[PDB]
Amino acid sequence: AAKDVKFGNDARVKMLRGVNVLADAVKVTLGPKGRNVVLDKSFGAPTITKDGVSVAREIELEDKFENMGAQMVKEVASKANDAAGDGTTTATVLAQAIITEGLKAVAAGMNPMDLKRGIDKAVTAAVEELKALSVPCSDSKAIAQVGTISANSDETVGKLIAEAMDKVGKEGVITVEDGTGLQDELDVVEGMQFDRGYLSPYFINKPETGAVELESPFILLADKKISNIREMLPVLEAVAKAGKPLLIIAEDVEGEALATLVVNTMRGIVKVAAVKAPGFGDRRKAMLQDIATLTGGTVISEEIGMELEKATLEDLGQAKRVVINKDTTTIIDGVGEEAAIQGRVAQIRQQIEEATSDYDREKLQERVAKLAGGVAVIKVGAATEVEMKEKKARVEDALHATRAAVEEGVVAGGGVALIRVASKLADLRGQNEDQNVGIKVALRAMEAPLRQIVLNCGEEPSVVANTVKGGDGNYGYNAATEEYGNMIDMGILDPTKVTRSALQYAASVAGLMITTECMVTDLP
Amino acid sequence: AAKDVKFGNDARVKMLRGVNVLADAVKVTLGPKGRNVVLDKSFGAPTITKDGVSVAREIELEDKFENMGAQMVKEVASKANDAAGDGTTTATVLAQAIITEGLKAVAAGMNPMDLKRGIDKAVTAAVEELKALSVPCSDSKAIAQVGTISANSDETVGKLIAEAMDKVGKEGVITVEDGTGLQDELDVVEGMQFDRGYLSPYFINKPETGAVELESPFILLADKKISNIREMLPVLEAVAKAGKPLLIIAEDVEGEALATLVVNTMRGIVKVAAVKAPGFGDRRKAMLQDIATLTGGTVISEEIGMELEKATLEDLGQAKRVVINKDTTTIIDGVGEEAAIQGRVAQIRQQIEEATSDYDREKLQERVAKLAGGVAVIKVGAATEVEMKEKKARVEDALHATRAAVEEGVVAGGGVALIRVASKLADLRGQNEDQNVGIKVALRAMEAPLRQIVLNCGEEPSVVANTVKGGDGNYGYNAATEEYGNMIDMGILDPTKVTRSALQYAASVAGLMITTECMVTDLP
Amino acid sequence: AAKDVKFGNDARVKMLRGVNVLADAVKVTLGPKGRNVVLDKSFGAPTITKDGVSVAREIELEDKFENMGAQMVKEVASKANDAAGDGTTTATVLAQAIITEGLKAVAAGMNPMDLKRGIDKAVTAAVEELKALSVPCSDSKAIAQVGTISANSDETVGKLIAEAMDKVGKEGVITVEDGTGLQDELDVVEGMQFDRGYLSPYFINKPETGAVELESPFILLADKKISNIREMLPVLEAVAKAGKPLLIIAEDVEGEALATLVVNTMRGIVKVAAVKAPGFGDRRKAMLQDIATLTGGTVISEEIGMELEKATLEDLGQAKRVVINKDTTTIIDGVGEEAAIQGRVAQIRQQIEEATSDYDREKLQERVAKLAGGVAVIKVGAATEVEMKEKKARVEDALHATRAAVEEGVVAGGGVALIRVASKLADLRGQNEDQNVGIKVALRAMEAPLRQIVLNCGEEPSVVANTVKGGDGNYGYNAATEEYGNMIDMGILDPTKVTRSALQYAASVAGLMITTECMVTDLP
Numbered sequence A, B, C: 001a002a003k004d005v006k007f008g009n010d011a012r013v014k015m016l017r018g019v020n021v022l023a024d025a026v027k028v029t030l031g032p033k034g035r036n037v038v039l040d041k042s043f044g045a046p047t048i049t050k051d052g053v054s055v056a057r058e059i060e061l062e063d064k065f066e067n068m069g070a071q072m073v074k075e076v077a078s079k080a081n082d083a084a085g086d087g088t089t090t091a092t093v094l095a096q097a098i099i100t101e102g103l104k105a106v107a108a109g110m111n112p113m114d115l116k117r118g119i120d121k122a123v124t125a126a127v128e129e130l131k132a133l134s135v136p137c138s139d140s141k142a143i144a145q146v147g148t149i150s151a152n153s154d155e156t157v158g159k160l161i162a163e164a165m166d167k168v169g170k171e172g173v174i175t176v177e178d179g180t181g182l183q184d185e186l187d188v189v190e191g192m193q194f195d196r197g198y199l200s201p202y203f204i205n206k207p208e209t210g211a212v213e214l215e216s217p218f219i220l221l222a223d224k225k226i227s228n229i230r231e232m233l234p235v236l237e238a239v240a241k242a243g244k245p246l247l248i249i250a251e252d253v254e255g256e257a258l259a260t261l262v263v264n265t266m267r268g269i270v271k272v273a274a275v276k277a278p279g280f281g282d283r284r285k286a287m288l289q290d291i292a293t294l295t296g297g298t299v300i301s302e303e304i305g306m307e308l309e310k311a312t313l314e315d316l317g318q319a320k321r322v323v324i325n326k327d328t329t330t331i332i333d334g335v336g337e338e339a340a341i342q343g344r345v346a347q348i349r350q351q352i353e354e355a356t357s358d359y360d361r362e363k364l365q366e367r368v369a370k371l372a373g374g375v376a377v378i379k380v381g382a383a384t385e386v387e388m389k390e391k392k393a394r395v396e397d398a399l400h401a402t403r404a405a406v407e408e409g410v411v412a413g414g415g416v417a418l419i420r421v422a423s424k425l426a427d428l429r430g431q432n433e434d435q436n437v438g439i440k441v442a443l444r445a446m447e448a449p450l451r452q453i454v455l456n457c458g459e460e461p462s463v464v465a466n467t468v469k470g471g472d473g474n475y476g477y478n479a480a481t482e483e484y485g486n487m488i489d490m491g492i493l494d495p496t497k498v499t500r501s502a503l504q505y506a507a508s509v510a511g512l513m514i515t516t517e518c519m520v521t522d523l524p
């Protein structure tokens, strides 16, 4: 492939122009007054979104040299999204400013690497000052406020997420799904629920409910595929004599069991119901042990050393009450020893802290929530699918912000936290004059989010920036009410993790970009 | 893919131009005087239709930026069609007006999101006022009038649908099909009819009829595939002694049965006929239970715990009289206990209210109609297929409008309902001046359907709008007779659900569209 | 696909231009003096035809907007062909006139839908007046005259079809095939003939004839595949003792039978021949029952309850005399009970009147003709294949016209019937002035066929139209002799069904076309 090369300022000019095209589209979204971008999906209706990471992945430029600049700043937004749902737009705005100021310094002949070292020195110091500025958030009032700000000032979204925050507990997982009702509704599942349904419609003992309710059940957690009632019988006889209902969890079941079960249940000899084991593989096995510990029961298994037919009635688990639908299994309140259950939750927590796949760790979190916490799903409600998608993105970002707020605390919102940290690090000096110039580039860039929110509002950014810089503590401009007040008091709060992540990601990519002296790309 | 980006007014201009191209084609159809659009089907003759949703899906523009605007307003018409058959054109006209007025306000510098909040505040209030304005419709005179208006003023269509409305009852389902006779004919099926036919032509006991009529039959509702008369015999012997005819419903049947049955029937030993079970799968099983409850009989099944050959004569169902053709099975008046049948209809109604697939819910409605209501099919009649298609769309829309009218009542038609609700919500004020401007945009847009119907008539829209706005109650312009009168008295009625749905869908998509500040699309 | 849209007059102009291109090609053919169109078949020689439906399917225009108009008027000719073979050109001429007059009225600002209602009101009234004008045709003199006019004034074609009309009877079916002899010849098959031939050349008992003639045969109509003489023997022994010849009709036959049959027949022990059962499937079974009823015999079948070998000599059918060739089977005059045969013909007639597939109904008509009527084939004769094709189309149209004439009577030909009906409906008035204008458009269009026939002759259309309109009854212009006289007396007769069908089809498509206000089609 023939390669066209460009050098020095000419290369840096096209690279900056590409950064400007990406930054401009993301910049319009920044702020409560920020508008939305209609990204075009060719196979379908265009999508209207205020999410910066969404816009970033979409843009690429036909000028190859400009595209290289755009692709490199796409990274800061993408990693910010990986860290936390919010901060993707603010990271891009900070990165754009560091690149613009840095390129001007490189043009003055300042050594690019020395400026990079200076920028990094300032960022490391700033992150520490953000931790000092941070004050912890766990008040549900504060949790709602971080959610509301994260949802483009939607009070209802923050209010609902705080309640779901409340009900699930810390181990709990909150999820969002499309709900066709135009109002949002929150449902919190109680106890261990697996998404599997009764094998036979005949099993239903409550037809109006359409569900099988077994009060006081014993529970068999079985290994393997079991289509021999033929072999399982003496266990079954003992249960029939005992007279408590039974649940069978198992992997593969014929009519050999189900018709025999209908013969027994529907004519009132025995009281039984049966469900398919969740998911597949060794993940189903690991899960079955969690159920066994909860139910005061056993994973009853040939491959772990029991003939299944040898099982005694004490070898099974027990619990209060179960309800099963065609999609749903719920289990109320286990016989299992509380310290054993807490031990398994902690033993799982060791797996959670060691977990090398975050997505696998989420599944572990779902297992933590079934075992001790709760699962909450928020039904995002909108008249049209256009509205549903933008609504869900705002609710998802609120979910991520609330989690970040609890973990590492909260800082003043609207960019006043970055302004205050920059003022406190003004005397920070690097080893050489280029490092000193680099430190200044980072501090000036930190004022950029406040300026852009004010620009979107339409007020003069510099005049407002001067008033906020002149002010102290959390004094800041409320963009929505166009007034100056304490941000914490006015409810404008940003999670510390998202602000710290935005600075670190922007500085790393921007610092490398200023050092570029040659660009090599395919000839047009 | 190289992406070309546009910003601010330039982006909004092309987006509005795309909305205008779609809106203009749908607008011509609005009103009784509205003409028809010849959409071109490349594989076949072009289609002449007055249906807005049909036109909307068809249009796309080669200008990529304009196409994005057109695709987004296609949604309001498409969702309106999903909600109810009618309202697809009115929703587009309302949406076009809100976008045009909103874009002008955004040009004045009004904050786009604040206008969106104001528009939403007005719409929520307007929907409540439409419910107050709504008066219930169930008079067959009124049901015919909503059908007639929904069929471009076809009196015969409304008249026929009211009768079919009458005969089926509320649980009943009405369907439309092409009928080659040039006059429309309605046929109402009575009782449970499944579309399956006699397995053997030899079964016919009434050759001139070409159908098997069994008077006083017993009915076997069988499980599984049964090609062993070989095994079924002792049941069959008991019936032969009893001397009432029998029907066999079953899944798979050889000549092992049919020739033996011909040997018995055609030489007068026994009196029998046999049909194939309807559809396939577990849906056939769920259906067979409904037949069993109706016939005072049983789903006789190995897999639900009976050897089939053990069945007694009391274990079967019974009914008055059956008739079977090569396509058709009809069953007259069952032995089943009325409260058991009503219970199963209610138990099914629980499934209906829980039903997550609407299309599956329709099949449940067909099962409700076979069990307690009726099924009516309207044979749309036209000289040519060009005429048949436009005729059927008008009859289909009338079917949807009549159902909507019964459920949520009726409002004045011709746009006077939207004009009256807008007048009653004039003092509604939002939190800030942009929200106040947003409320006004929605109220002005509500006058748009009346204006467009008058424009299609050719009378001056503003002069008529002023007279209707000056008037009160249901006073409105009868477009067909070019006169002003009470709409309810003149028979111009619109279902409340369709008017409310049009406003809500238009407001949601339009409100998002005004907020757009940047558009990203593939380079031409 | 990018869509280019056009509106109002601009759209109507291109649509009319497309109608004009199609209409012009079909118009030249109208009239006895009308010339022929050389449609080009790319894979082969071009085809010279005077048939309008043939020309219509061929034409399409490269201008997309013009093509949409052409495709829509293709429908009126195509449906006219489906109704009856003739009337395809006259329907196009009537449709073109209604569209031209209607578009001019829409240009004057007349409401398009109101004109459509007026046109429809006039057409409904005109169809009733055509029924009053109609006088029944069944005289073979009149039947020949409708055939002659339908064959571009070919006296021989009408004369031959009247004789074939005569011989077959009403239940009879007449067919046309290419005959290489340059003179047309008619052959009428007598009685039941199926197109199957002797299985063995050795069966021939009359070698000079090349056919097997069995005088006084018994007939076995067998079920299934039978290659066991091995099993069939005791029946065969009884026949050999009886000494009347036998025919075997059956599905699949080895040399196991045929060599054994040659051993018996060719050495004079037994007298037998054997043929393959016609077609395939259950249609062959339904047909075999018709043969059984005719022959005073039985479908002898295991699957309908007889072991085949149990059959007695009375269980078979009998008839006068059979002749079989390698292609042909003929059966002369059955033993079957006449009221049973008439009953089966009537029982079949119930199937005929119920018949949902017209093409399947034709096969039922062939079965009606074999059972009670006759089958006649006309061998179209021409020197070249170019001539054969045009000759056959003219003979086919004559066949369709003669059938239409007998069913719904005859009206004056040359367009004078449409002129007279239009004069009688002049005072018909619609509800509003646009409906009145619509009625006038239809009446003026009805004069169009007469004008176009006169234009093709070369005489002034308006001068002749005035003389015919001034005249009364059947007074009309004989185009061939360029004279004015009573049409019935001069032999110019048109079937009422074809004239009524042409008006109805033209009005429906034309009425929709005038209402078009926007056209949407793919960008060139």
Ligand SMILES: Nc1ncnc2c1ncn2[C@H]1O[C@H](COP(=O)(O)OP(=O)(O)O)[C@@H](O)[C@H]1O
Pocket: A029, A030, A031, A032, A034, A052, A085, A086, A087, A088, A089, A090, A091, A149, A150, A152, A153, A413, A414, A415, A449, A453, A477, A478, A479, A480, A481, A492, A493, A494
């Ligand atoms: N009234 C407000 N005052 C100032 N800024 C606000 C206000 N409300 C929300 N914000 C937000 O403005 C910034 C939010 O950025 P945003 O546009 O939501 O995308 P992202 O969080 O991904 O960067 C944050 O500084 C946050 O404070």
Ligand SMILES: Nc1ncnc2c1ncn2[C@H]1O[C@H](COP(=O)(O)OP(=O)(O)O)[C@@H](O)[C@H]1O
Pocket: B029, B030, B031, B032, B034, B052, B085, B086, B087, B088, B089, B090, B091, B149, B150, B152, B153, B413, B414, B415, B449, B453, B477, B478, B479, B480, B481, B492, B493, B494
């Ligand atoms: N004579 C009439 N007066 C005013 N409007 C009428 C009259 N008859 C029917 N309409 C209709 O005009 C509008 C019907 O819109 P329409 O063109 O049928 O498509 P859609 O219902 O999908 O919006 C409704 O306001 C309805 O009232």
Ligand SMILES: Nc1ncnc2c1ncn2[C@H]1O[C@H](COP(=O)(O)OP(=O)(O)O)[C@@H](O)[C@H]1O
Pocket: C029, C030, C031, C032, C034, C052, C085, C086, C087, C088, C089, C090, C091, C149, C150, C152, C153, C413, C414, C415, C449, C453, C477, C478, C479, C480, C481, C492, C493, C494
């Ligand atoms: N001598 C005649 N006088 C007037 N018209 C004639 C004469 N002979 C045949 N015609 C025919 O002219 C019209 C025949 O139309 P034709 O060209 O055969 O195609 P099509 O029947 O499909 O419309 C009919 O009105 C018929 O009467």
Ligand SMILES: [Mg+2]
Pocket: A085, A086, A087, A088, A089, A150, A397
């Ligand atoms: Mg954010």
Ligand SMILES: [Mg+2]
Pocket: B085, B086, B087, B088, B089, B150, B397
């Ligand atoms: Mg409508």
Ligand SMILES: [Mg+2]
Pocket: C085, C086, C087, C088, C089, C150, C397
């Ligand atoms: Mg003709």
